Structure formats: C-alpha cells, structure tokens
DNA sequence: TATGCCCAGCATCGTTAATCGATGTATATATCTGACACGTGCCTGGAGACTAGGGAGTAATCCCCTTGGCGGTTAAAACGCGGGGGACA
C-alpha cells in the first residue's frame, strides 16, 4: 500500500509530463518513485527528492553521478541522501 | 399215337481257393552335381625394413570481427470485419 509510479523507456510525451509534475507538487502523498539509469538520468529534474538508493553500479562510473543529478539539484532544501 | 413218367445235359446262380499282377513300403547300393578344402604352380601386389624430408603439431602473439547493450523513429506485424468467389461435393 505505497503510493507510488514508474519511470521506464516506454512512455509517451504527454504521459511522462503528467506525473513529473504530479510529483513535484507541494501535497504529494507518494514519496517512492522508481526511474532508470538511461532513461532516468535521461534528462528532467526532481526537486521535492531527497533519498536516492543505487541496487547495483551502471556498468561504469558516472551514470550514477548524473543518476543522482536529477534528483540532487539547486532547490532541493532536504540535504541529501544516497 | 398222345400223355404222363425214368435217365442224361449244359447253363443259370452262388461260394472257395490258387494265381498273375498292381499298389504301398522299406533297405542297402550305384549314379549325379555341386561343390569347399588342399596342393599344385607362379606374380608380385603387398609386407617388411630404412631413410629423408617436409607437413603438420604446437606454442606465442595479434587484432580483427563478432556479439552486446542501448534507445527513436517508423514501418511492419497483428486484428479484426465483411463479403465475395473459389473449393468441394
């Protein structure tokens, strides 16, 4: 029962725009979100966002840097966690 | 003289026994053919023995090619609906 929604490479346009502002709104219940490394890191920012956990290494250093890029930006006002 | 009576006389039927011949069944012998093994004779195509050499084995290095992963469009596969025309009787 955690309210949640996925971020993968098989979305359209007018769909992932929905709800990566769903998300950044001021009274957004779901604090658990899930993205990838490519398509994660693709491009976008999270701001409300403060943890970010890593199940296994991109293959490479780097696409974890950015991978926490998205998520570790300017307004985010929680420190940060990873 | 004709008509019933005595004394032979071969063919009718059936039954017994000996005989020539056909059929069925052994039983040891004399052909018929078809060999497979051996020794006869000879050739050399293989075996046996030795050499020499170059192919192929292996090992050590290289670097190219094949597989992989990924993500964007953009055609293609997929589906269905509908009804016509070919299959099949």
Same mark, same amino acid.
């Given at each position: 029962?955690?309210?949640?929604?996925?971020? @993968?490479?098989?979305?359209? =346009?007018?769909?992932?725009?929905? =709800?990566? @502002?769903?998300?950044?709104?001021?009274?957004?219940?779901?604090?658990?979100?899930?993205? =990838?490394?490519?398509?994660?890191?693709?491009?976008?920012?999270?701001?409300?966002? @403060?943890?970010?956990?890593?199940?296994? =290494? @991109?293959?490479?250093?780097?696409?974890?840097?950015?991978?926490?890029?998205?998520?570790?930006?300017?307004?985010?006002?929680?420190?940060?966690?990873?």
């Amino acid at each position: 029962g955690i309210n949640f929604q996925r971020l @993968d490479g098989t979305v359209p =346009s007018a769909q992932r725009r929905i =709800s990566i @502002d769903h998300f950044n709104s001021p009274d957004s219940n779901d604090f658990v979100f899930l993205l =990838s490394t490519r398509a994660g890191g693709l491009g976008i920012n999270l701001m409300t966002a @403060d943890t970010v956990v890593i199940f296994d =290494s @991109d293959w490479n250093p780097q696409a974890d840097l950015q991978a926490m890029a998205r998520a570790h930006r300017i307004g985010q006002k929680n420190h940060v966690m990873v």
